[PDB]
C-alpha cells in the first residue's frame, strides 16, 4: 500500500511555492473536472474523423479508472503506456490519474529494448499498448517477460486481436462493480517523465509541480477557449504535453488537434480543415514547413502562434516564421526534468528571433556556472544549474547519478551552456556531454 518513493522538496519551499499560488494541492484531473462543470460539450480533442467534448473525455476516463479499480490496480502501483498521437492516449493518461496509478508513457518510437529497461525499473501491473506497434506484432516480447517474473497482471491493447483484452472496450463501458478509487495525494507522484545515452530515465512528477507548469504556461502563451492546437510532436514529451501542449489547452478549455507526425502535407490540410491556431514544433520539422509554405499558403493562415524548441534555432531561421508561415514565433527552451523558458508574446522581435526566453516563474532560480562551480560574470556563457516550484529534486531509484547531478542546494545541472543576455533572456549556446 506504499506509494511510489521520490525525492521532495524541502519543507520550506514546499510551504513558498503554496504561499505563493503556485501548487494549489488538486489532482491533474482537475483539468478535466472543472472543463467538465464550465462547458461539457465543447471540444476537447479532435482525432482524425472523431470529435470528443470535455464530458465525453470525462466520461471514458472514468469508465477505464472503473475498469482498473474493479481489476485492484489503484495507489501503489505502476503502468507501461505506449500509444501513438491519437485521442486514447489522453483518456488512459486521465484515467490512470483518476486510478491513483503511477503511469511510465514510452514515446511510441521507442522499441523492446527501453520497454524491457522500463518494466525493469516501475514493475507495471499494468501494459497498454498497440497491435500496429513493431513489439506487439507478435507475442514474442510479451512471452518473454513471463520468463524473468515482469509478466503485468493486465495487458491491454488499441487495435486487438480476438484474444487480447481491447483497450477500446474497457474504455467504451464502466465496470459492473463499484470499487473506490482516487487520485494519489497532490504532493505525490502522478506519473513519470522521461529525461531526453542509455534509456531515458524516469522523472517523477508530482500533481502540485506539473499542474502549475501546465497552468502557468497556458497563462505565458495567451490560451483560451478558442485555442486549437495541433498535436504533430510525440503526445507524451514535456513539450507536447505541458509547454503549454495538450494540458495546457485543456486547462483553458481549448482543443487538442492530432496529428501523427509533423509531415507538412497531412500537417497542413489538418490546419485548413479544423482552423488550427496554434503549433509546436522542432526545427527539423519547421524546416520541413517552411519549403512547402509559400505554395501552401492558403491551408496554414489559420495558425497565429507556432512554438518552436530543440535543437538548433539560429536567428536567420527564426526570422523565416513570421516571414513564411505567417504568425508569430514563440521559443521555447524546456526539459523534462522541469525547468521551462518562453520568449512572451510581447517581447520585442531581437528576443524573438535571438533567445531561448525566460524561465516559467519568478521562483526558477537559475545559476551560470564556470567549470569551477563559481558563477560566472554576466552576459558570460556558463553551465546552467536551476532549481523552482516545478524542478524535480532527482530521478527515480537513481541515487547515484542524482549525486553527481545536484549540488548541496539542491540545484540540477542540466548539462546546458547558456548566458544570460542584458535583456534577461537565456540564449542556449550548446552541451556539455
Ligand atoms: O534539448 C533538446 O534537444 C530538446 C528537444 C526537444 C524535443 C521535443 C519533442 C520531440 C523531440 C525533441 N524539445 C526541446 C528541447 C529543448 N527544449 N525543448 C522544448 C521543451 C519544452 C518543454 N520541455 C522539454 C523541452
Ligand atoms: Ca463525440
Ligand atoms: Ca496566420
Ligand atoms: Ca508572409
Same mark, same amino acid.
Given at each position: 500500500?506504499?506509494?511510489?518513493?521520490?525525492?521532495?522538496?524541502?519543507?520550506?519551499?514546499?510551504?513558498?511555492?503554496?504561499?505563493?499560488?503556485?501548487?494549489?494541492?488538486?489532482?491533474?484531473?482537475?483539468?478535466? +473536472?472543472?472543463? /467538465?462543470?464550465?462547458?461539457?460539450?465543447?471540444?476537447?480533442?479532435?482525432?482524425?474523423?472523431?470529435?470528443?467534448?470535455?464530458?465525453?473525455?470525462?466520461?471514458?476516463?472514468?469508465?477505464?479508472?472503473?475498469?482498473?479499480?474493479?481489476?485492484?490496480?489503484?495507489?501503489?502501483?505502476?503502468?507501461?503506456?505506449?500509444?501513438?498521437? /491519437?485521442?486514447?492516449?489522453?483518456? /488512459?493518461?486521465?484515467?490512470?490519474?483518476?486510478?491513483?496509478?503511477?503511469?511510465?508513457?514510452?514515446?511510441?518510437?521507442?522499441?523492446?529494448?527501453?520497454?524491457?529497461?522500463?518494466?525493469?525499473?516501475?514493475?507495471?501491473?499494468?501494459?497498454?499498448?498497440?497491435?500496429?506497434?513493431?513489439?506487439?506484432?507478435?507475442?514474442?516480447?510479451?512471452?518473454?517477460?513471463?520468463?524473468?517474473?515482469?509478466?503485468?497482471?493486465?495487458?491491454?491493447?488499441?487495435?486487438?486481436?480476438?484474444?487480447?483484452?481491447?483497450?477500446?472496450?474497457?474504455?467504451?463501458?464502466?465496470?459492473?462493480?463499484?470499487?473506490?478509487?482516487?487520485?494519489?495525494?497532490?504532493?505525490?507522484?502522478?506519473?513519470?517523465?522521461?529525461?531526453?545515452?542509455?534509456?531515458?530515465?524516469?522523472?517523477?512528477? +508530482?500533481?502540485?509541480?506539473?499542474?502549475?507548469?501546465?497552468?502557468?504556461?497556458?497563462?505565458?502563451?495567451?490560451?483560451?477557449?478558442?485555442?486549437?492546437?495541433?498535436?504533430?510532436?510525440?503526445?507524451?514529451?514535456?513539450?507536447?504535453?505541458?509547454?503549454?501542449?495538450?494540458?495546457?489547452?485543456?486547462?483553458?478549455?481549448?482543443?487538442?488537434?492530432?496529428?501523427?507526425?509533423?509531415?507538412?502535407?497531412?500537417?497542413?490540410?489538418?490546419?485548413?480543415?479544423?482552423?488550427?491556431?496554434?503549433?509546436?514544433?522542432?526545427?527539423?520539422?519547421?524546416?520541413?514547413?517552411?519549403?512547402?509554405?509559400?505554395?501552401?499558403?492558403?491551408?496554414?493562415?489559420?495558425?497565429?502562434?507556432?512554438?518552436?524548441?530543440?535543437?538548433?534555432?539560429?536567428?536567420?531561421?527564426?526570422? #523565416?516564421?513570421?516571414?513564411?508561415?505567417?504568425?508569430?514565433?514563440?521559443?521555447?527552451?524546456?526539459?523534462?526534468?522541469?525547468?521551462?523558458?518562453?520568449?512572451?508574446?510581447? $517581447?520585442?522581435?531581437?528576443?524573438?528571433?535571438?533567445? #531561448?526566453?525566460?524561465?516559467?516563474?519568478?521562483?526558477?532560480?537559475?545559476?551560470?556556472?564556470?567549470?569551477?562551480?563559481?558563477?560566472?560574470?554576466?552576459?558570460?556563457?556558463?553551465?546552467?544549474? +536551476?532549481?523552482?516550484?516545478?524542478?524535480?529534486?532527482?530521478? =527515480?531509484?537513481?541515487?547515484?547519478?542524482?549525486?553527481?547531478?545536484?549540488?548541496? $542546494?539542491? =540545484?540540477?545541472?542540466?548539462?546546458?551552456?547558456?548566458?544570460?543576455?542584458?535583456?534577461?533572456?537565456?540564449?542556449?549556446?550548446?552541451?556539455?556531454?
Amino acid at each position: 500500500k506504499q506509494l511510489i518513493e521520490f525525492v521532495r522538496w524541502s519543507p520550506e519551499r514546499a510551504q513558498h511555492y503554496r504561499n505563493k499560488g503556485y501548487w494549489i494541492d488538486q489532482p491533474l484531473t482537475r483539468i478535466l +473536472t472543472v472543463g /467538465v462543470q464550465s462547458h461539457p460539450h465543447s471540444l476537447a480533442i479532435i482525432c482524425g474523423e472523431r470529435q470528443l467534448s470535455y464530458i465525453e473525455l470525462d466520461r471514458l476516463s472514468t469508465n477505464l479508472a472503473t475498469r482498473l479499480a474493479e481489476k485492484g490496480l489503484g495507489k501503489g502501483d505502476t503502468a507501461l503506456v505506449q500509444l501513438p498521437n /491519437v485521442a486514447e492516449f489522453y483518456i /488512459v493518461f486521465f484515467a490512470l490519474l483518476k486510478a491513483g496509478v503511477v503511469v511510465l508513457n514510452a514515446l511510441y518510437s521507442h522499441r523492446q529494448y527501453e520497454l524491457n529497461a522500463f518494466i525493469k525499473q516501475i514493475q507495471p501491473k499494468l501494459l497498454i499498448g498497440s497491435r500496429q506497434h513493431e513489439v506487439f506484432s507478435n507475442n514474442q516480447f510479451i512471452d518473454s517477460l513471463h520468463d524473468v517474473n515482469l509478466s503485468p497482471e493486465i495487458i491491454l491493447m488499441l487495435n486487438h486481436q480476438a484474444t487480447d483484452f481491447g483497450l477500446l472496450d474497457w474504455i467504451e463501458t464502466p465496470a459492473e462493480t463499484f470499487v473506490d478509487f482516487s487520485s494519489t495525494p497532490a504532493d505525490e507522484v502522478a506519473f513519470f517523465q522521461l529525461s531526453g545515452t542509455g534509456t531515458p530515465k524516469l522523472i517523477p512528477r +508530482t500533481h502540485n509541480d506539473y499542474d502549475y507548469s501546465v497552468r502557468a504556461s497556458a497563462e505565458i502563451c495567451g490560451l483560451n477557449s478558442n485555442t486549437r492546437l495541433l498535436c504533430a510532436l510525440p503526445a507524451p514529451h514535456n513539450f507536447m504535453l505541458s509547454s503549454p501542449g495538450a494540458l495546457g489547452v485543456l486547462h483553458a478549455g481549448g482543443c487538442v488537434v492530432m496529428a501523427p507526425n509533423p509531415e507538412p502535407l497531412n500537417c497542413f490540410s489538418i490546419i485548413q480543415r479544423h482552423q488550427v491556431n496554434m503549433a509546436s514544433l522542432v526545427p527539423s520539422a519547421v524546416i520541413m514547413w517552411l519549403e512547402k509554405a509559400a505554395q501552401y499558403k492558403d491551408q496554414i493562415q489559420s495558425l497565429k502562434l507556432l512554438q518552436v524548441g530543440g535543437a538548433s534555432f539560429p536567428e536567420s531561421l527564426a526570422r #523565416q516564421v513570421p516571414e513564411v508561415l505567417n504568425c508569430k514565433l514563440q521559443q521555447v527552451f524546456g526539459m523534462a526534468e522541469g525547468l521551462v523558458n518562453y520568449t512572451r508574446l510581447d $517581447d520585442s522581435d531581437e528576443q524573438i528571433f535571438t533567445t #531561448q526566453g525566460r524561465p516559467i516563474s519568478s521562483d526558477d532560480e537559475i545559476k551560470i556556472v564556470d567549470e569551477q562551480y563559481r558563477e560566472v560574470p554576466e552576459g558570460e556563457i556558463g553551465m546552467l544549474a +536551476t532549481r523552482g516550484p516545478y524542478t524535480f529534486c532527482g530521478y =527515480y531509484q537513481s541515487p547515484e547519478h542524482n549525486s553527481q547531478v545536484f549540488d548541496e $542546494d539542491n =540545484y540540477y545541472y542540466s548539462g546546458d551552456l547558456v548566458q544570460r543576455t542584458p535583456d534577461g533572456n537565456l540564449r542556449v549556446v550548446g552541451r556539455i556531454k
